[PDB]
Amino acid sequence: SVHDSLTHLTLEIHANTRSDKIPDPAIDEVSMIIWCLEEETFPLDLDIAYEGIMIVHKADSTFPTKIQHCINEIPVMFYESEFEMFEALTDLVLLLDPDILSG
Amino acid sequence: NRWVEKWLRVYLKCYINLILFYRNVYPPQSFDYTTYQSFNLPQFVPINRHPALIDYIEELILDVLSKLTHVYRFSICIINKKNDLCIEKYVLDFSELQHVITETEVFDEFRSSLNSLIMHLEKLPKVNDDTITFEAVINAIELELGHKLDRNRRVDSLEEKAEIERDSNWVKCQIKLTSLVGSDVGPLIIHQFSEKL
Amino acid sequence: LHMDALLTKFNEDRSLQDENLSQPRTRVRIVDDNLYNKSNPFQLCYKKRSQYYHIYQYRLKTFRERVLKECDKRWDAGFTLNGQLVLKKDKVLDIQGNQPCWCVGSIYCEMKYKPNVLDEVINDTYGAPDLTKSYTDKESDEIMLEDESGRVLLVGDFIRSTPFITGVVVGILGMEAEAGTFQVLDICYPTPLPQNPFPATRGKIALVSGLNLNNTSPDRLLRLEILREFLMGRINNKIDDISLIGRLLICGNSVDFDIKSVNKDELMISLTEFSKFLHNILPSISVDIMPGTNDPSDKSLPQQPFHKSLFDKSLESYFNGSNKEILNLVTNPYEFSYNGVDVLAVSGKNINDICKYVIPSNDDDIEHRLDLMECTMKWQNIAPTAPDTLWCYPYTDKDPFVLDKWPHVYIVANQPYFGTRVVEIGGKNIKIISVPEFSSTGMIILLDLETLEAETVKID
């Protein structure tokens, strides 16, 4: 009935490398942002689906629909650059306000 | 001894298998009609599929073939356990054994002998389970077992151990006779006999 | 009546005529013209020996071109619907509107694997994970059309009463109703292949499969001897009707063992047991040997013939290369031109592997196998399941399993039951025949060459 635990959150990151060079944060860019929320501890039951996938796309008119139809379970949001993706991730973190970050 | 060893081996194997099957000494469900038991058998005979009985009969036949140089008679006894009395006696003669070709002819002779044995066994009444067991008796010409351990038999390989365990596994001991057809081939001159009551 | 009465009525009334034994009746001559002509299609080089993707691409391109030609021949311009006009679309993402359209694209379904084969393979991998978790972790039953640009849920009623397997190219034409789900009104199939003309004295062919001569089943040898005596004209005694069987066709499964635990002795014994039967049947009726899935040959579909060895030394007179019409060892698939009649025979590994899966749609009976065979004949693809049936490097730029000429009779073996079906596709005529095993219910199929009528012969 009352909250007696801590919220939990995780995140994964995929980056495109060049012939399996162990992608480095100095020259390799991020392409996908996958996060999951533990629905067991989370309170207030908001409309967030406890999951989300963010994919960058410079915009050709078929990739977003293809990914949406391939997923068909979790809503996917697209952005035009990595800075917008980071801003959206920060906004999501501020909206949910998790007390624990994992990885 | 070059090729008659395997032929006599498979003949004794089929003999023991048919004797054990047709006399209900073991459950028939444990037997299966086959043709290969590590050796090409001349007929679809019912061979058991139990490990202990397998190497039991294997060692028995090996000892018999090793002692064949002095054995002239091999008998398989069938006795009851409630009373140590011989009920059936199946004799296999080895008169001179024609000791020191056309394997198909040897297989045909063995098949004829096994068919005669099956025909003879089919006329006997049904035998019940529950301790109707079997034994083994042999008759040699001139030999003495059970006395090779007078020097502690210091072993060095597997052949000496096998010889010792074979010479030490024997103990000395002391109606309607029905003859059957044997093997009239040159190298394998074998005769067959049988006893009842 | 008793058996004695029938014996006294039959044996005493024996004619004992026509058995001259000096001027015997000659068997009807039946020659397979495909023996030495050219272009053995399924004959590959074992020394030559992933290429699966390369094959997939060529197959998809050929199928797409054929489907496009069929659409041009059927859905050509001016083929208006009831109220709306019909249109064409190049990409799968282009069909979005209240108008009907026709498009080409592959079909994608679930096609789950059977649980029996799952544990059967699991028991021989030395520490594999629970494959049952791979199917149960996911939340299934839906048919979609992929055209390299997207997927659309093909909801409808005409798809329900039709069998499908992933990888088939279909040119269905429909129209969306309320979402990204395209309906279906008609279903298109690729263009019909050219078929040789049926020829206008005539003999029959005996087809037998599923012998499975093993060292444990003795009833198989008795049935084999009975079949050898009946084909020799000694049992039926009607030489006027038995002499019409020109040759016998062994489709597969002559020797059955478990390759896990076998030695050279058992295989040699089984081959010599077969060799006898062969030596008794050869000088009376020709024979056509075909391998199978449990035969000592390759496990893939295009199996080479067994060998020149693995038979008795007394058969060396037949393996001299000159007497080929008497005994012919051929690959697993073959298109025999028996006196101008083109018949295709397969060991049945394709249908058995297709049935080895569990598809959660399309609503093991005789009708199901017949429908699967009809679909295989229509799709012009003998092997629908590539990795389970086909092996690496099957061909270069020209797959043999894709049908190029429709035959007259499609013969499949190694099936539990027997049946026949005459299908009409594009004005053509194909007769599918299901050959059962000879071990259990050892029926003999007699196929005529004058009217394509198949008869059965039971042996107990």
From Swiss-Prot, chain A:
Q: Which cysteines are joined by disulfide bonds?
A: none
Which parts of the chain span the membrane according to its record?
Answer: none
* Organism listed in the record: Saccharomyces cerevisiae (strain ATCC 204508 / S288c)
| Family membership noted in the UniProt record | Belongs to the DNA polymerase type-B family.
Let me see what the UniProt entry remarks about domains: The CysB motif binds 1 4Fe-4S cluster and is required for the formation of polymerase complexes.
User: How does this polypeptide assemble, per the annotation?
Assistant: Forms DNA polymerase zeta with REV7.
Q: What is the name listed in the Swiss-Prot or TrEMBL entry for this protein?
A: DNA polymerase zeta catalytic subunit
Top-level taxon in the UniProt lineage = Eukaryota
Swiss-Prot record, chain B:
**By its UniProt entry, which Pfam families does this protein fall under?**
HORMA
Where is the secretion signal located? none
Locations listed in the record: Mitochondrion
Q: Where is the HORMA domain?
A: 2-181
Return the InterPro entries for the record: HORMA_dom, HORMA_dom_sf, Mad2-like
Which proteins does it associate with, and in what oligomeric form? Forms DNA polymerase zeta with REV3. Interacts with REV1.
PANTHER family from the UniProt entry: MITOTIC SPINDLE ASSEMBLY CHECKPOINT PROTEIN MAD2, MITOTIC SPINDLE ASSEMBLY CHECKPOINT PROTEIN MAD2B
Q: What is this protein called?
A: DNA polymerase zeta processivity subunit
Swiss-Prot record, chain C:
Provide the catalytic activity annotation. DNA(n) + a 2'-deoxyribonucleoside 5'-triphosphate = DNA(n+1) + diphosphate
Query: Could you tell me which InterPro entries the record lists for this protein?
Result: DNA_pol_a/d/e_bsu (IPR007185), DNA_pol_D_N (IPR040663), DNA_pol_delta/II_ssu (IPR024826), PolD2_C (IPR041863)
The PTM N-acetylmethionine maps to: M3
**What does the entry give for GO biological process?**
base-excision repair; DNA metabolic process; DNA replication, removal of RNA primer; DNA strand elongation involved in DNA replication; lagging strand elongation; leading strand elongation; mismatch repair; nucleotide-excision repair
Keywords, sorted A to Z: Acetylation, DNA replication, DNA-directed DNA polymerase, Nucleotidyltransferase, Nucleus, Phosphoprotein, Transferase
**Which cellular components does GO assign to this protein?**
cytosol; delta DNA polymerase complex; nucleus; zeta DNA polymerase complex
Instruction: Output this protein's name.
Output: DNA polymerase delta small subunit
Modification type Phosphoserine: residues: S22
Q: Write out the annotated subcellular location.
A: Nucleus
Known EC number: 2.7.7.7
Q: Which family does it belong to?
A: Belongs to the DNA polymerase delta/II small subunit family.
Pfam families on file: DNA_pol_D_N, DNA_pol_E_B
Q: What is its main location?
A: nucleus
Extra remark: Present with 626 molecules/cell in log phase SD medium.
The answer, when asked if Transit peptide is one of the entry's keywords, is no
What one GO molecular function would you report for this record? DNA-directed DNA polymerase activity
Main function: DNA polymerase delta (DNA polymerase III) participates in chromosomal DNA replication. It is required during synthesis of the leading and lagging DNA strands at the replication fork and binds at/or near replication origins and moves along DNA with the replication fork. It has 3'-5' proofreading exonuclease activity that correct errors arising during DNA replication. It is also involved in DNA synthesis during DNA repair.
Fill in the subunit field for this protein: DNA polymerase delta is a heterotrimer of POL3, POL32 and HYS2.
Q: Which domain of life is it from?
A: Eukaryota
